[PDB]
Structure 1
Amino acid sequence: GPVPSRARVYTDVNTHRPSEYWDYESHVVEWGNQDDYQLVRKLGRGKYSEVFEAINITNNEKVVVKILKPVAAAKIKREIKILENLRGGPNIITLADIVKDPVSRTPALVFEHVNNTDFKQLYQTLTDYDIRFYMYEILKALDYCHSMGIMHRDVKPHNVMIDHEHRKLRLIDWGLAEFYHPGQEYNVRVASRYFKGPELLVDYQMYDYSLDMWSLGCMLASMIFRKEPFFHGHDNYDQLVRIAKVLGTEDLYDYIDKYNIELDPRFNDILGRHSRKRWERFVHSENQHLVSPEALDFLDKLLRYDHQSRLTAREAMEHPYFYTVVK
C-alpha cells in the first residue's frame, strides 16, 4: 500500500509537550458571559459559522464574534485548544473569549477586531515590496503554528486579515486546523479547491505542515501573476490536471511512484502528458512590476508535488525574495 511519510521538521513537538497540550477532547472550556457582547452587524456566513462585528460593552472595544453552526459545534474543543495554544504567537488571531450564544445554543468565539483594508484594494494595489512584506508576516504565523505542532489546513486569502494602514496581518479561522502526529492519516477533504495540495488531490492521507506551504505558493502565484486563482480547477479532479499543465506530468508520476500512490483511474482519460513549464511563461506587461527572479525561484520551491521537497516556513524566511523587506 502507500509508503508512510513524516514531516522533516517539528515531528516531535506533540511528543515533547504534555498530553493536555494536544488532547483537545480532555480540555474543559471556561465559559464567559454572552451579555458582555453586543452584536452590531453580520459580516458573513460560511458553511461552518456566522461571523459578526460586535462591541465588548465591558471595555467599549470592537470585537468579532463567530457563532458556530451545529455541524461545526462538535469539533469546537479542537479549534478552542488550538487558539489557546497559539494565543500571543506572531500574527495569530487572538481568541478573547468563548460564550454560549443564547439563540443558536452553540459556542460563540470572540476575537480581537482587525480594521481590515478592503480585499479588492489590497489585491489591486499592494506593491512588489508590500507583497514580500506580507508574505514574510504570513511565514511568521506559519512557522509559529508548525513549531507548535499545528497545521492550519485552510491557508487562503479569505483567512488572512490585513490592516494595511497599521501594516498588521492576522491568520484567522483555525476551524480546520489539526495537531500534527507522525504517522497519523488525516482527512483529505480540507482546504478550498484552488489551494488544495497535490497530496489531497491524489488522496494521500499521511500529510503534514507542508500542505500549508503549497497553499501559500498558490496565493503568491495568484498575486504576482495577476491570475485569480492560479490553478483554476472546475472540480477536484480537474484541479490536479490544472496543476499538471504547469508542473508537468512526469514529476507527478515521480511523486505518486515515490509514495506508491495509485491515481484514481478516472485520471487516465483527463491527465494527458504535459511538460513542466518555465515560470517566465506567466510573465506579461501587466504583472512584470510584481515579478523578479527571486519571486520565481521562491515560488518554484513552494509549488512542488513532493510535500517532503517544499521549503519549510523557517527556510522560506531566509530566501532572497525577502532580503528587501525591512526587518
Structure 2
Amino acid sequence: DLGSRYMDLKPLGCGGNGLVFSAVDNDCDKRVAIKKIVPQSVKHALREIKIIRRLDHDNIVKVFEILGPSGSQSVYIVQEYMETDLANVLEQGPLLEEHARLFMYQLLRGLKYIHSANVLHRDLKPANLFINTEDLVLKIGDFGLARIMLSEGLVTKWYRSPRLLLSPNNYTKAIDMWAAGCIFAEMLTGKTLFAGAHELEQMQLILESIPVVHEEDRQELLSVIPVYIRNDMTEPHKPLTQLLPGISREAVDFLEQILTFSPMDRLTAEEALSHPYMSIYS
C-alpha cells in the first residue's frame, strides 16, 4: 500500500535484483509493474536509472517513474505491465513458425535500438522478454540493460555464447546476438537449444553442433579442452538441422548465420533485420 497512487500491490515474481509487484495506477485505471530495490548496490542502481530513463522504443518495456520513500520522485521503478513472459508462453509448447518469426523480428528491432544507443542486454533469456499475447507484441525487459563500456548459482548460463563461456566478464553486442539465436531456436522447438549443467558441458554441446572455422578459435579451444578438439572442426557431429528436425530450411539457414562460433562471422541485429527471412515485415 506504498503511496496513494499505487493500490492493490500483488507479487509477480523475482528479478536478479529485487521483487516485482503488480499494482493498479489510481490516476489512470491501468495496471503497472513495480520493481523494489534494496553500498555497491547504490552505484549499480544509479547507472541502471540513467540508461533506462533515456530509452524509448516499441520493443523495450516502458519505464514510467523512479520513486523512493512511498511515491517520491529503497527505490521503486514503475514500468508498463505486460501480460506474461516468453518463458511462460514456451512452457505450454513450441510456437507456430509465424509467431516465432514475428517475435524474433521484434527482439531484433529492440536489440538494433539499444545497440545503436551503445547499451547491451547482459541477461537476454525468455524470462526477460515480455509478451502481450493479444497484440503479439514482444518487449525487452529493462533489468540487465548496461553501457557497453551473491546468487551466482541462480544466473542462467544456457544463452551464453562460446566467447562468453571462455571470457566470462567481457560483454559485447555480439553476445546478445548469440542469445537471440538461442531464443529463436527455443521458440521453434519449445526446448532449450544448449542445456549444459556447467560451462564445460555447455561448450561440449555447442561444439557438437556449431562449426569452428577459424584457426585462432580452434587454437584457443585446444588449450581449454584438448580431448573434444579434432583436426577438422568445420563439420559438427550433430549439426543445427538435426537439433531442429521439424522446422523449415529457411529458419535453420537464418539461424546458422546467427549461431556462428566467432562473433566476426555473426550477423549484427541490423544485418539480421535486412536478411530476406526478416525483411518480410515491410
Normalising TM by the smaller chain, what interval? 0.7 to 0.9
What CA deviation, in whole Å up to 9, does each residue of 1:249-272 have, x standing for no partner? x44764264xxx57774x346x45
Choose the corresponding residue for 1:210, options 157, 174, 179: 174
Aligned partners of 2:78 and 2:244: how far apart in 1?
Answer: 42
Aligned partners of 1:280 and 1:262: how far apart in 2?
Answer: 24
Q: Is 1:299–2:262 an aligned residue pair?
A: no
> Is the 2:121–2:144 contact (alpha carbons within 8 Å) kept by the matching residues of 1?
yes
Unaligned runs of 5+ in 2: none
Q: Which residue of 1 aligns with 2:29?
A: 60
Q: Which residue of 1 aligns with 2:272?
A: 316
Aligned partners of 1:299 and 1:159: how far apart in 2?
Answer: 21
Q: Which residue of 2 aligns with 1:193?
A: 157
Q: Which residue of 1 aligns with 2:7?
A: 38
How far did 1:66 drift?
A: 0.7
What CA deviation, in whole Å up to 9, does each residue of 1:132-162 have, x standing for no partner? 1111111110000001111112111111111
- After superposition, residues 196-275 of structure 1 pair within 5 angstroms as 196-203=160-167, 205-226=169-190, 228-248=191-211, 250-251=212-213, 254-255=216-217, 257=219, 261=220, 265=224, 267-268=225-226, 271-273=228-230, 275=235
Choose the corresponding residue for 1:111, options 53, 60, 79: 79
What SS class does the counterpart of residue 44 from structure 1 fall into? strand
Choose the corresponding residue for 1:147, options 107, 110, 116: 116
What SS class does the counterpart of residue 240 from structure 1 fall into? helix
Q: Which residue of 2 aligns with 1:6?
A: none
TM normalised by structure 1 equals: 0.73
Q: Is 1:279–2:206 an aligned residue pair?
A: no
Q: Is 1:176–2:144 an aligned residue pair?
A: yes
> Is the 1:210–1:312 contact (alpha carbons within 8 Å) kept by the matching residues of 2?
yes
What CA deviation, in whole Å up to 9, does each residue of 1:35-78 have, x standing for no partner? 42225211112341100101122223210001124874540122
Aligned partners of 2:223 and 2:76: how far apart in 1?
Answer: 40
Choose the corresponding residue for 2:129, options 152, 155, 160: 160
> Is the 1:244–1:252 contact (alpha carbons within 8 Å) kept by the matching residues of 2?
no
2:46 counterpart letter in structure 1: K
Aligned partners of 2:22 and 2:61: how far apart in 1?
Answer: 15
* Change in 2 beyond 3 A, CA 1:193/1:101: farther
> Is the 2:96–2:188 contact (alpha carbons within 8 Å) kept by the matching residues of 1?
no
> Is the 2:95–2:188 contact (alpha carbons within 8 Å) kept by the matching residues of 1?
no
Structure in which a larger fraction of residues adopt helix: 1
2:127 counterpart letter in structure 1: H
2:203 counterpart letter in structure 1: L
How far did 1:192 drift?
A: 2.5
Aligned partners of 2:46 and 2:147: how far apart in 1?
Answer: 12
* Change in 2 beyond 3 A, CA 1:191/1:215: farther
> Is the 1:222–1:229 contact (alpha carbons within 8 Å) kept by the matching residues of 2?
yes
Q: Is 1:90–2:46 an aligned residue pair?
A: no
Q: Structure with the greater relative contact order (CA < 8 A, sep ≥ 6): 1 or 2? A: 1
User: How many residue pairs get matched?
Assistant: 270
Moved over 4 A (4+): 70-73, 117-123, 204-207, 261-265
Aligned partners of 2:125 and 2:265: how far apart in 1?
Answer: 21
> Is the 1:34–1:99 contact (alpha carbons within 8 Å) kept by the matching residues of 2?
no
* Change in 2 beyond 3 A, CA 1:110/1:137: same
> Is the 1:41–1:53 contact (alpha carbons within 8 Å) kept by the matching residues of 2?
yes
What SS class does the counterpart of residue 54 from structure 2 fall into? helix
Q: Which residue of 1 aligns with 2:104?
A: 135
Unaligned runs of 5+ in 1: 1-32, 182-188
> Is the 2:84–2:130 contact (alpha carbons within 8 Å) kept by the matching residues of 1?
yes
Q: Taking every aligned residue pair, what percent have the same amino acid on both sides?
A: 27
> Is the 1:161–1:171 contact (alpha carbons within 8 Å) kept by the matching residues of 2?
yes
Aligned partners of 1:283 and 1:149: how far apart in 2?
Answer: 33
How far did 1:117 drift?
A: 7.2
TM normalised by structure 2 equals: 0.84
1:180 counterpart letter in structure 2: I
> Is the 1:152–1:178 contact (alpha carbons within 8 Å) kept by the matching residues of 2?
yes
